[model samples]
Target: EIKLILQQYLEKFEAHYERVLQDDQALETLMDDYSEFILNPIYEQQFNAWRDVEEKAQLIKSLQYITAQCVKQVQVIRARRLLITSNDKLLLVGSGAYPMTLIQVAKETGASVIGIDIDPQAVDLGRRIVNVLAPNEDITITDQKVSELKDIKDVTHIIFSSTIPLKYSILEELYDLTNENVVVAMRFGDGIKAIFNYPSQETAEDKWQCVNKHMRPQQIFDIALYKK
Candidate 1:
């Protein structure tokens, strides 16, 4: 049956995200495959499918806890210490299905957050979740790219997702579009974890500075800070 054969493919995929980074061609293949299969489909189902309020609330709270485990709380705290306070507006690139990072960062830091995802279902679910958690707060979710945003210039801080493939490319584009003094927090991976994250890349020296970086010994990704 079709279902029987899918287990091998699913098992292979489940292994892919856990594997260590390989050389050039392997990375290229892994990146393409995982994005289209693992990241897109599974997250899409989790974000789109139905569950009761009590049940869904638990799934929602689960990611809230996961973010804390990923040390996103400390990342926001670090941002605050870097002078990004409640008055500053934060923009999250590649917010994807959950936008849990956006919710956690805004709620924990008391900062305004604008989340943009490339999926319609994602933004719709995100907007609904925001209504429940951050009602009356300036937490807005929409399906827009960085260049498409009206308030791109007003963003004081930005967070780039670990799973976004073209992280450096967008940062390069943001270099021209965003505010001159904007601070960017990019989550990346290195060594064994590079297969999951897009990995860290150097930005142009003349354009930005690596003000700080955080390495979590246990977490899959690390945070790097860039300031214009």
Candidate 2:
């Protein structure tokens, strides 16, 4: 009787896994739930000032791709220390240009990859490339935002690409999700201030209120990354 129940449980899990995997709508619902909070509104607000969608997307993609590739390339040269391991899962947040480089780095490192972008076009193209490169790899390409990234606790690395500084509000949740050895490899205009200042990271009720009005987006990115 116990054996039969165990077998049934396994079958149910497998079925549910397939359902979540094959169901576009279900996966989309998951992504939307965990994506980061600030990107879209910021992009929309900026788009009013400059109205080139593809061009802007290309710029973000190009910049992030180049920078992340360079960082990984340097790591590879110095030590065998690639960002994430082949056995570990990675959350490549920001489905735009930023996650592209993260995906490339993951592929090179032999890690299982999940590419999350906000734009359907970018995700579609990335999915095609990933399929071409590693047909057997688990590449979860989605147009979901990082806001839906809440329950992702076992992730080995959070390879994110954003030009904006991560607010303390979301960082609190992400910090909880990451494993102790988690490497929050990010590409901001600067580096990882959120983690560095995590000890003293202000509360959500602080003056910033998730909006650092004093800092420009580029400045925030630079400060977070400590960009040289």
Candidate 3:
């Protein structure tokens, strides 16, 4: 009975993601509920129950697809004539269960990377994975909010999850916190991808200007770069 109920919940969750494609309001509401009630608790339970097993399993997990996606994201950024060097620092917001982006970004760019998540359990799990995969790399995951991050004044790049609520507001705050050269990657979707992410919006003129927008043919989300 419990298993069946969980399966039903999973299906509804997936369906909601799909429904967001046609229903923008649904997308916004889903993001709100997910952040406030779903993400942290689920991750905490998974980490507590299967920490060692998951670590060992993920160590050998190919995760090739995620690596490919990360490469594609960087490729798009570079194609727009943006530069990401070894001296740069990258920050990823809402680095949830996998932290695939964090690992891939560090490996590909050789830049100092940090993933900030609001969920403590997600941070714990992400940190564990980083310790295993890139033991020698300068990567850290912390449970912190964008507004409270004090040491990120020089962050060269920022990535925001499409599923996160108040993303616009967060971007607004980041404008004042980061350097003028910071490349903010706002990930969003429309049509089918909108099920998984909320749609994108225009930032205030004094805050941000969109330099480039690229829609991936293979993925559900698209990337937009903003300069502040």
TM-score of 3: 0.63
For residue 141, model 1's alpha carbon misses the true position, in angstroms, by 0.9
Assess candidate 1 and give its TM-score to the true structure: 0.63
In order, what lDDT does every prediction score?
A: 0.64, 0.44, 0.63
Give the TM-score of each candidate: 0.63, 0.42, 0.63
TM-score of 2: 0.42
Q: Please provide, for model 2 over 1-228, each residue's C-alpha lDDT reduced to its tens digit, 9 standing for 90 to 100.
A: 322322343344344445643542232332232122112444334434554566544443443343333332332222221116678877766544323465576668877666675556556555665565556766678876455655465567665554323533445566545556555544333212221111124444522222221233333232222111
Candidate that beats the other on lDDT, 2 or 3, i.e. the better one: 3
- Across 4-108, the per-residue lDDT of candidate 3 in tens digits comes to 323343455456544543443343343454333323445335433544554323321222223223323332333222216689988888776466668887998
Residue lDDT tens for model 1, 1-228: 222223333455434423421311132353355335324434435434544556444433332233222232223223333325788999888665455567788877888788887657567666776777678789878888789888789999999888676778888888888888899999986543443455689889998789999987556579999997
Where model 1 places Cα greater than 4 Å from the true spot, the runs are 1-10, 14-83
